[PDB]
Amino acid sequence: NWCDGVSHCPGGEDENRCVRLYGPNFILQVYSSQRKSWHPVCQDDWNENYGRAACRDMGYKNNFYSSQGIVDDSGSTSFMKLNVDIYKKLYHSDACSSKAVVSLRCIACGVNLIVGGESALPGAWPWQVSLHVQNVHVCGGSIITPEWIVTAAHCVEKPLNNPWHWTAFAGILRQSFMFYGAGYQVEKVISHPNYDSKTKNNDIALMKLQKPLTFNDLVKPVCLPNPGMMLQPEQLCWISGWGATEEKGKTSEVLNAAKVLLIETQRCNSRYVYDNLITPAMICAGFLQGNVDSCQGDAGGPLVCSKNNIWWLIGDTSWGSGCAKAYRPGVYGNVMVFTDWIYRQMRAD
């Protein structure tokens, strides 16, 4: 009674999300109401036309990159075969002739060439966006699709909740070259409906451009995380932005980047770091010794991790205490959690 094709729901929250990609290999899975679980789609009688159908229903509109078959690595026993919405064209089977599982990529992403870091090179972080208000850097963001940018919700609180205040600059490393009209205009700003301004819970927001970005050698998307990333307890990740290079400093002229490690929530919630302040929707990153971390002006900036040769968007700069201080790691929004919300908004457009 989740994806049976029956609307019976005032918001349509269930029907809107029945198709997903799984793990680092973008395995296509569909939710079945009969068994109340996700099952991989097999490649027998599967083609690009079906792949495109699945992308559009996943909020990627008319974007499509590739579709091919892989050997299963999700550890599934039951697979769905192709016989309405794409998820309604599938039925359960024990074993499919092709024995190959559909791997679907709806967009080309995750490919490239702050305190305690160093100046970024051209093409090093193609997804970086500088978000200006009154032609002054306020926050950053990350490119996910040509017209969609991920940022933080605390950045866009009233009266900055009005889209016409914001312009986005991409492909530019230096603030001095972010000229008055060289950026893109934001048409709408959407903040998470359960955002808590006192605890900064669910601190995520999306911005949509009225003029889609043109992707090239310098400007590219970063991949949204799939369910089942299975990252290491101490994953090697990168942060970047135009924030201050020192506590109580001023905005940096050029994009800087630094390498950080992820920190387990179990440790962050201890009394000696952030006594029970870190929710499932939050990720810690940085070092417990300080030295390397984000700072003022990096809000909304991406936290990206490399796995399977792909750069994934794991989090976004949200809050912290001090600036690169001991026992006080930066805290990022957990994008892996908000991924379903993001798809619902990209699709409902």
Partner: protein, 280 residues
């Protein structure tokens, strides 16, 4: 008449934490007798020929003795880096020395467990509440400056709303525990202090005033690390002295020296250079 064997057979035997040294000079000795008056398990020499002891003369012979924990005899193998040879007594490798392993009857032997660290005693360390034949050894050693004090300033602590530290008065000449008041969202007087959670597993060793160190040749353990969250009292004042509780002292443990009803004892013989002749 050096009388080394009487010193070795003295039933007041130190733990590795406070090993004792004695210097024998201007006297005669006989190794054959020495190794018969003590129940020797093993005797070997390092960078020195054992057979050359007989008939030779030395400027002086220096002996360092202590009880051996059952579980850590192997820690006394030269070149090892466990606990006994790195936090208690380091064995030299460049000097001519001989290592004597021997034992005394447990029924007579009494272990002297004493903490030689002045900064531990200064701030409330007393004695070891241990049973007979318990041998105390250090696992981690910490050194501090002459300005060290584990308690927060009463004036500082009085202003804390979250994570308020223990506080007390400190000895004249020392500094108070380093703490600061921060804000973590709507939390405004969130007090952040050093050596957390403790000096052994501290997340940031650079912020802590207690530095780890290893013992070199001829010196004892710098001292036990202190849990600064147990020193002084919560909501304290200048009317109370900065004293630590017994379970504030970390980085030490103990075992028994008992095999076949005997206590195993280590004695390192250092041959220096004389008149100290082995006319055996």
């Amino acid at each position: 008449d050096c009388d080394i064997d009487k010193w070795l057979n003295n039933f007041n035997v130190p733990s590795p934490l406070n090993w004792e040294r004695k210097i024998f000079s201007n006297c005669n000795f006989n190794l054959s007798t020495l190794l018969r008056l003590v129940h020797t398990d093993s005797f070997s020499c390092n960078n020195f020929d054992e057979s050359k002891i007989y008939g030779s003369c030395f400027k002086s012979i220096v002996l360092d003795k202590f009880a051996i924990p059952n579980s850590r005899r192997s820690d006394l193998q030269l070149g090892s880096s466990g606990f006994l040879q790195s936090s208690n007594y380091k064995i030299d490798t460049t000097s001519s020395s001989c290592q004597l392993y021997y034992s005394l009857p447990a029924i007579n032997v009494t272990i002297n467990n004493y903490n030689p660290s002045s900064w531990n005693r200064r701030y409330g360390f007393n004695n070891f509440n241990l049973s007979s034949h318990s041998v105390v050894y250090s696992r981690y050693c910490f050194s501090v400056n002459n300005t060290f004090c584990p308690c927060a300033k009463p004036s500082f602590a009085s202003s804390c709303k979250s994570h308020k530290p223990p506080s007390a008065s400190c000895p004249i000449g020392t500094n108070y525990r380093s703490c600061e008041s921060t804000t973590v969202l709507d939390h405004t007087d969130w007090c952040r202090c050093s050596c957390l959670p403790d000096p052994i597993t501290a997340y940031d060793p650079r912020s802590c005033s207690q530095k780890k160190s290893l013992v070199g040749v001829g010196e004892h353990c710098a001292g036990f690390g202190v849990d600064e969250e147990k020193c002084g009292v919560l909501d304290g004042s200048y009317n109370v002295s900065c004293l630590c509780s017994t379970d504030a002292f970390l980085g030490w443990s103990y075992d028994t020296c008992v095999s076949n009803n005997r206590c195993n004892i280590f004695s390192n013989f250092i041959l220096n250079g004389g008149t100290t002749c082995s006319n055996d």
